[PDB]
Amino acid sequence: TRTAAHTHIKGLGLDESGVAKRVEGGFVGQIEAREACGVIVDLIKAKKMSGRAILLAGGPSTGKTALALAISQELGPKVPFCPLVGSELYSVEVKKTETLMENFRRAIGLRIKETKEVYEGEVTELTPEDAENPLGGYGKTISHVIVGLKSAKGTKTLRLDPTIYESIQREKVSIGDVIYIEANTGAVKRVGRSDAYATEFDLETEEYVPLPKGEVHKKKEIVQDVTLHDLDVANARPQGGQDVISMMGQLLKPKKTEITEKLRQEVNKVVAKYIDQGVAELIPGVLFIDEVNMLDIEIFTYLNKALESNIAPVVVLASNRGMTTVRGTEDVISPHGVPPDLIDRLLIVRTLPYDKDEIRTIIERRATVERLQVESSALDLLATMGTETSLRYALQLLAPCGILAQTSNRKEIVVNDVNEAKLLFLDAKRSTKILETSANYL
Amino acid sequence: VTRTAAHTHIKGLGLDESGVAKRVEGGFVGQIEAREACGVIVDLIKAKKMSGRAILLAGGPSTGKTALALAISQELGPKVPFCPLVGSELYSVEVKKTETLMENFRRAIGLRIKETKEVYEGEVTELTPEDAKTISHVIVGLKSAKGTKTLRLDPTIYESIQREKVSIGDVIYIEANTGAVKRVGRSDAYATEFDLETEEYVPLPKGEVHKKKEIVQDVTLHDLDVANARPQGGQDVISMMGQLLKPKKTEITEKLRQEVNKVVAKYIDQGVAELIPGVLFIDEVNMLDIEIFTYLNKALESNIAPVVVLASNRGMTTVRGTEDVISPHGVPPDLIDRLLIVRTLPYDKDEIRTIIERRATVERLQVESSALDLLATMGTETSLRYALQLLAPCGILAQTSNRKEIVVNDVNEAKLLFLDAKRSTKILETSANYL
Amino acid sequence: TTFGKTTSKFTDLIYSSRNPIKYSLPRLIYEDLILPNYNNDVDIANKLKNVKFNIFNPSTNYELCLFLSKLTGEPSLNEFFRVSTTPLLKRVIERTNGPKNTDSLSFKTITQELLEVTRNAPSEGVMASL
Amino acid sequence: KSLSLIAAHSHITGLGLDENLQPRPTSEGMVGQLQARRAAGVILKMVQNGTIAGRAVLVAGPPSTGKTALAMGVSQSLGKDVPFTAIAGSEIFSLELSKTEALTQAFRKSIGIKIKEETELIEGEVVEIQIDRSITGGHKQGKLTIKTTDMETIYELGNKMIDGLTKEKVLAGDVISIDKASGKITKLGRSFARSRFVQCPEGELQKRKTVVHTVSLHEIDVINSRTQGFLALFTGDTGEIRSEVRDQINTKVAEWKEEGKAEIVPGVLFIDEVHMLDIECFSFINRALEDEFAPIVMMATNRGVSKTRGTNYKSPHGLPLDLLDRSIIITTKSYNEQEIKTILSIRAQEEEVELSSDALDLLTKTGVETSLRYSSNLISVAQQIAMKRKNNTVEVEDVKRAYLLFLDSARSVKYVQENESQYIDDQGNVQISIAK
Amino acid sequence: SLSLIAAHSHITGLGLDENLQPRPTSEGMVGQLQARRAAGVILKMVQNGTIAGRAVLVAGPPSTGKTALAMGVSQSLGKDVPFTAIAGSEIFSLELSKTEALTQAFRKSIGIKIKEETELIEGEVVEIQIDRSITGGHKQGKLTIKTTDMETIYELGNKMIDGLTKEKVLAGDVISIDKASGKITKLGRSFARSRDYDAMGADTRFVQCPEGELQKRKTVVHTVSLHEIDVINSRTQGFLALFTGDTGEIRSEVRDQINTKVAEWKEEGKAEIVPGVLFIDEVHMLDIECFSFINRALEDEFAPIVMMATNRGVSKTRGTNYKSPHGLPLDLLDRSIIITTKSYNEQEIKTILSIRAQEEEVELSSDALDLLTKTGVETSLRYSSNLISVAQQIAMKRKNNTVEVEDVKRAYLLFLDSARSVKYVQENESQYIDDQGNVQISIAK
Ligand SMILES: Nc1ncnc2c1ncn2[C@@H]1O[C@H](COP(=O)(O)OP(=O)(O)O)[C@@H](O)[C@H]1O
């Protein structure tokens, strides 16, 4: 098992119609932010509103990213979640507007159900039946094709169209192969060779697949999940033909292109048409852009434009700045690095720093997840480091303590182990103190 | 007939067997210490044992840094690779600058392969394929002026023969190792089959059909890198019209480089190839950005880095790409630890006079003694390069007056006609509008 | 164009269109740089750079070929040497839809299994219309 | 050949010089500037000797003093079959080529190779053509009768000649040229036979003709590189040719000159407005001039002590001192009244405008007062005003009317400076309304 | 062999015992008795593999041994574990984004291990007989394959014959056939049939006829990084992008799909994850966007352990206008633990110079080595290290085997360090081009 700075949080931890308790889901404290995030989860599950923006703000190491992953865990794996960093939008292939629109479309999911009628099994016989009165000038005029199938606890012969004989001849279907006949379009395909013929030839280059289970004929309802960006990139890519340009672009580097608003419009109308028929279902998700202080003001203005769309998901932003200039502008002093036109469109959730007991409990649960045993006085010392230097410096100094404990052949982490961890690995403050008092061209 | 461009009187470093330098020998006058340090560096390069050695040679303008690097290149010989470069060429609009630096690094490590050229040439007399439909072999009979000779051939060479539309009586060229087939033309003896025809007629080869020759192929590592990393695909032998898609330079992955190193080491272990490390020379090193200066630190720590020679004429100058970093020679302090600096000294009057006499000798001009003294005084008064550039208009003005020896009057007219930087700046300062 | 025009039992109609701009080249450049002969090494250097020192050669770099065959799933180990030494236009003309074994690291993308369903799908299907 | 309306330097047919390189006061369309013309004649002799390489000269002076006139005089005095590349300073700032690559291509375009070859040709007038077909038409027999003004012959044709004659129709009385070794047949025209129009050729019909080729280093550089064909010489996307093919071309050219199969013809590269190059371009130009295959570079600039591009300091002529150290400088001076009036009379003769003496005196006065180019632009615009009154000679009234209608520099600055509320300033303020 | 004597090739692993206690001088590393212990803890942290995504920082003055420590970690890590060593200037690419280049460098340092079991039949083909049925739909075959020792006869399928007709094989052809997978390769032509054709051809090559048994069993282990799977599953023919670098901003959907695929393979049991180390030398010249992405990209499960080296004090971070410790912002320095290197004394410099002269096959006297030690105390260490190599050649120009004091004095005279160059520049500043471009070329005033 691999652990990386997270995966000790499992949802938010509220009860039904009530206050989130202090010890639930791996969260310690942050009660008001957890209640607000639960209200946000209920807003997303209501499946009504579009283009709602939430900015959570606070100091560093307060639990903004943990709250975002708690939102994603509470919604479930079916609801899409697109985590983003603010530096990801600057690309050297397309404009940053198109990258924002692509990550915007990646966060809306579609649930499509469909009924499949199939015919699979091992080929028993394959006989093109001739007509009673053949036409002149031709040979082997097929009137119909008799094909016998064989599966587990099932055997059925079929009368087929004359026009699937070309499909038999293209896919090279012979006796003993196991095939796959779609009902409506015909269009047979070779799954492989039957497993009973695996010892036919000493040396061969084939793929022998087990004989398929169940009946030859079955009706199965298949529910498929795609996002709207997959529909956009599938419709933009031209359907596979025989032109040199399509296969040339298949053999070359797939450079991104500025997808027009027209294609997105047609995709939205056909999706709404099949939603109105009761077949498809629209699942909006969460686009989480972290550290949004690094965005340019053009992206902020396009966010102002794109939040007014009908199909937009709920976008969550996070920042740790105070009074800072927006990038691209030399004089706009703004809270959290966000320009004031966007700030009016969003609600702000505030996160508060922790205390001695919360730091101690967080360190204890992180040591529990990391499969380590810590003695209580070592826990109190680590909480003293957490309130003295940083919570994250205490959290990253658990694995070297376990390594030094295993070096001395002990499964317990004690005081001198964390003293050696202090002596070996420095935090930022002592490193800055070393930098300030050294003049050796450092 | 013979051309001369600012050099070519420099033939070598001009050292003895003990490493000491004479005064005037090899086209170099003066600067004993820099020449001796450069000879030590030439010995280090000839040892072929170390990698990533960086030398900076520094001094004022027109002191002889480029002449010293050229003397290194002539002392090493034509076998050793030498890649001269200016620092402005590392900026390209196709790839990043670090990749261009990597290619220029790998251009300085060479290989030597010993190969044999085997050629069949003559007039086709018999062309008889036979079926084993697939042909198993074809028998071709070639004829020259010294006899005939028949050959069995594989079907691939018969396919290449059918590509070139070879019939009976054509003069063809076959290489035994590569398998290349070239059709020279129809033979001269079959030229009167028609009075007018679209076929060129060539005579019979006067030598033997079989020809054997031992050759040496000199390639570098960068040739193998670009041969193994064609993005569009392998080009054919002849493409007069261009490729349909334009192939652009790409960022070559280090996995390709380590595969090329593995294959080259495998061929070296069998005694086929010989490794010849060389010299990469970067003139005007102060025109490099700080990012290339940082990448040079890791690029000098590879196992197959060549010997790198840099030159600069700046003093305590700000490094490019920085605003509050002042460093000697425009070279950052992180990189300046890794080199050894060779100092280069300015010249005196007698050295300038000897340089002017040598340049007049190599350009096949005769000068008088008083003209030489006036040119030496002018060289000490303005610059050394001014007299060297003014030597040839003096010869032209002596030629137009139907004389062969330059005198003081031609030097005076050439000084009147062409100016230096100082007099041009004096005219520039005391002028009304834009000179 | 400068074609063959008439300055006025069948009539021959042969394509004869040319360009009025003529680029003239000496015979020496062609015969001494582009064609092989006894005094140059076009074919020798071509063989040295394309066959002997190629990294996809199975006679010298079999480990890389086996690694790439496990990576992609090509049934032949000469496929990479054939791909790397023929032009892109010749590759895209004679490309075939040969089968590959399932035990490989290259599986099918979501976009591809969306596109492969609707090759012969009719109208009024939801996946085909979308 | 070489279609042209009238150029601004169309009167300069070269440098007016004697056999002892002395400048005549008026010769070949050039007047005045005796020292500059003598220096350019010395540079012309340097180019025509061809034994030295990589020398850079600089032509500096005030604007409108005849620097481009000097460059055009050198280019016309070189004549044909010698390479002359003229570029501007802003031309090398490409989006697909680096600056050093563009400078390298411009450097190698200015040096050429003279290759002499001979081919055997057929030229004559077609008398009569017979094509014979068999019963099945598998084989074709043919006979061609062709004549010149001195002989006549009949040729028996094979299959490929018959196919090459059926393609690109050839009838009787046509004058054609046949290349036997390549199979290319060109129709020269039609002979003078009423019973296009060219004459019947004379002399022999089988002629061995010698053609002298001149090909630059950049062309062989493009062809030897396999990354693109010879069509990149016309489309213009060569795309950063690698260095190793340039060393192969250099060694091949050296052994071609050693064997005697080729000669090297160096030329002149002219860089107009050299002050608009970056310092990286100057540093590349410093080290590119010591190569063996380097032309003679001519640079022209008119700045004083100005800021070098890409830096933060000022330098004489806009060029750094290390570039100026390897240069010999030719200085041009301003003109007198008589030189200005001689220039205006020559520009009158080239524009086919007949001038009165008083009109020429008024043009000389307003050219000394304002600018030479202003009078040289006024002279051609006065002829239309003269032709509107239906007379041939340009009088004083036409020159005064053209001086009233079209303004110059100082007058336009003067009318701007007391009407600046109606123009847009550096701060973007303007008043459009008439009142208030 | 294609390796020469590099800058630090004496370092072969970290000089530690079993109890993570560094020896004073062992296997290349001299001194640094706390940084070596911390790097040993980091090496055990990597070799356990149970945690992911943690960054350490190696800070100290220049010429102290930060990249020596990284080389020691790389050499003691062992093979089949990915180790990527990049600079800060590599990621500024014209055709790739900085974030995408960072993602590629991150995913090049974590790989999976695949086990393959092969059954190879390598031998020379003698004869191929093809038999067809009455219907003609399928073709049967007879193969006679021959080794130096033994010869047997196999059978072929229809797909065997179709694959054998391509890459056309005749008698005298050396092929190999896999029983389990059916892979086909043409190794070339035997040397016994090298005298008949009389001219080679383009596509042919001569290999020796194999010996030993025909059916040989051997297992192969392959280590494939996640970046290789990303490049392969992004195009039709993706290996050319692996060898030419034209991958070009691979989409995130295939990366999530490949992550799910790798988790599925680990759970089913045909693969296991081998984590690695990413080393970013000179991290101080990275943009603030790069630092932000490094901050938020270390919280993934498939993240390696990052080692960064900095020799900067309180400098200005690139892309901003303020100054920060180590040239890095405080949010990244919160997510780090710092290993601090300290400068050497005379004895450690003496031992390092002795080791470096031992590697280069240079024999020094005691007085010459003492002089080099004194120069390494006064000037930098690398100046003495280069002085060894040039004094060696000065020694053979005198026809002497070992170097002496005179050779070190001559190499000190002929070559200059930074301080002497600064002094001779400053006392003759009129002969050099300053920041304003002024210079004096003429020697007489
Ligand atoms: N309330 C909490 N309960 C448990 N763990 C927390 C809490 N808040 C923060 N953490 C832990 O602190 C570490 C760093 O928090 P992070 O998400 O980086 O905060 P921020 O987003 O404010 O920088 C994470 O590994 C997280 O597990």
Ligand SMILES: Nc1ncnc2c1ncn2[C@@H]1O[C@H](COP(=O)(O)OP(=O)(O)O)[C@@H](O)[C@H]1O
């Ligand atoms: N010691 C010397 N002997 C002969 N010629 C010299 C010497 N030093 C310099 N030169 C000549 O001076 C000219 C310019 O020198 P150069 O190599 O450009 O110096 P730098 O590169 O330092 O400007 C060259 O043509 C060279 O031939």
Ligand SMILES: Nc1ncnc2c1ncn2[C@@H]1O[C@H](COP(=O)(O)OP(=O)(O)O)[C@@H](O)[C@H]1O
């Ligand atoms: N000495 C001269 N003889 C003839 N025409 C001249 C002379 N000097 C200048 N001119 C003409 O004056 C016009 C402007 O001069 P021009 O050469 O463009 O100035 P500049 O030297 O600033 O480029 C040109 O048409 C040129 O033909």
Ligand SMILES: Nc1ncnc2c1ncn2[C@@H]1O[C@H](COP(=O)(O)OP(=O)(O)O)[C@@H](O)[C@H]1O
């Ligand atoms: N602990 C050490 N043991 C042996 N040699 C060392 C040690 N530290 C540094 N060196 C030597 O110092 C030289 C440069 O030091 P380096 O590792 O580059 O320092 P930094 O990484 O701080 O620049 C290397 O060639 C290496 O041989």
